[PDB]
Design a protein around this ligand. Sequence first.
Ligand SMILES: Cc1ncc(CNC=O)c(N)n1
Ligand SMILES: Cc1ncc(CNC=O)c(N)n1
Lengths: 301, 301
Amino acid sequence: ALETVEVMLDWYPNAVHTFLYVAIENGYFAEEGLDVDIVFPTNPTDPIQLTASGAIPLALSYQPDVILARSKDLPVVSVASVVRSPLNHVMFLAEQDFDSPADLVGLTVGYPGIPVNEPILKTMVEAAGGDYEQVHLMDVGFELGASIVSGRADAVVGTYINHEYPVLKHEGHDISYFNPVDYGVPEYDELVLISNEAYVEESGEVLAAFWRAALKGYEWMVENPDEALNVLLTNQDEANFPLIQEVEEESLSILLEKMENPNGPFGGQDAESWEEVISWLDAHDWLEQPVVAEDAFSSIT
Amino acid sequence: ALETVEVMLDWYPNAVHTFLYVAIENGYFAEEGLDVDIVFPTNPTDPIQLTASGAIPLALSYQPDVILARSKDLPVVSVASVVRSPLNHVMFLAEQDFDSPADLVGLTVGYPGIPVNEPILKTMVEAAGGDYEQVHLMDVGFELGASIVSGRADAVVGTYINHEYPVLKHEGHDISYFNPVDYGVPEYDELVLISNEAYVEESGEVLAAFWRAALKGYEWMVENPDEALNVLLTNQDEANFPLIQEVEEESLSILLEKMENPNGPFGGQDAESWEEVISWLDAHDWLEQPVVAEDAFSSIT
Ligand SMILES: Cc1ncc(CNC=O)c(N)n1
Ligand SMILES: Cc1ncc(CNC=O)c(N)n1
């Protein structure tokens, strides 16, 4: 009777996922006859791979990644834009005192294994005249903070200003960073709801029912900021990704601004954003097969 | 002219790679007309993946992985067994007090992101009477120790008894474990030298040149345990994977036993081991395409 839908988040639960949990808790999905199954990823890259393979119909990923994916012939399609601008920043301990991304040359940068991180770091490094081919990336999965703090990596990319940054500071670490948009990286959407082609064609109803629900979750979160932030926190995976309340409210405050759609409903996708993100990548030889903005995303409403 | 050959290590430099750095320092590779360039993986799955694609001609991986890779149609082939038995142990802080792998049900286990670990853990958990679907894997790439020491993970797999075990202990952690061999897993070769089919066909004289120099380095190590281990430590990656004199010589003591072919030459393989490991993976439904032991490995000399 209830349509069961698997939704794989992009990371372990945190402020950015608030709208989804509010949807669950308020029965918005039940009202829509859906049984939403929120799932965490085993590997950071699972979201796009599983969605692509058709194993799961929904997940949260990164716009630049969707393009990378579609460029490799994966049938991944963005059906909604959650965070309309970047969150990703390159981080390191203040003692490192790097002058610019070009100082990463000859050093090792930790990262979650997520591909999107390659074009971002490459652009940032070349933008400063360094030779990215001498920059060493070290996959640390979810252990982003530990890579930098332990010392095994000189810097990290994949960390968010709305999260990892305030957490490290809260934990006492003195963190400095480089903002990708100050080094040739476009204002891409950090996070987008993604599905696969078949499911968009074969199950448009379910997808429409889902977003309608998720949107109510969003609108409710917006009108009930604190209350909704409380919902997430209680639903946090305390065993593997414990959250700090103060850190999370600050995170939410940042995300709210970036999640809101100035000239349309929450989730509305801007064709301009995609077009330039594709050309940015296509320009740096990251796209093996051509990608078109009319195919990288579609409206499920 | 020296024949350039890229060799990707399975992990960062440690006791197990001593025979290779010895063959470089002592000039054995040069003697065989080759210029060997050791490269570290940025991603734990790189070895198998870059070899398969032809991007790299040589690398170190795991016997079960070669099978899985071939099961996925990748053209990789094992050209030498380096560590003839398992090293992989599931590890957790002594606090946990698990009675068996079935206690892992409902918890999260960290792993390097290397596929071979899924079949291992699943077999283990199932042998102890637990539901694996209820076990959560968390990708931490190279940050294995951190996953459990930070409490972010309840247990970890992928860690080696010759390295991580003595390291955690040396760092002050009371570690407990579960040997996969005690829980239905076969005595597979932990480390094996790999190449792709195309290369073994086109560059066999190179491979043979490379392996003689390698055998020579290996034999020197056996006659000069300590001098070799020092060659290794001086050639360690101190910035991203610092080593401890004591743990590393302890590690060598373990590997010396597992690397030696009691009767036969170093690197020698045989259908038996491969067929056993293949059958294991088929029985537990891990293979997609059937795999043939014969095609899975081949002598290099
Ligand atoms: C809180 C947080 N941190 C890092 C990531 C990883 N994204 C790109 O590398 C993510 N999805 N969420
Ligand atoms: C020292 C060490 N630790 C872990 C691994 C990873 N193997 C399987 O996951 C490895 N190749 N070497």
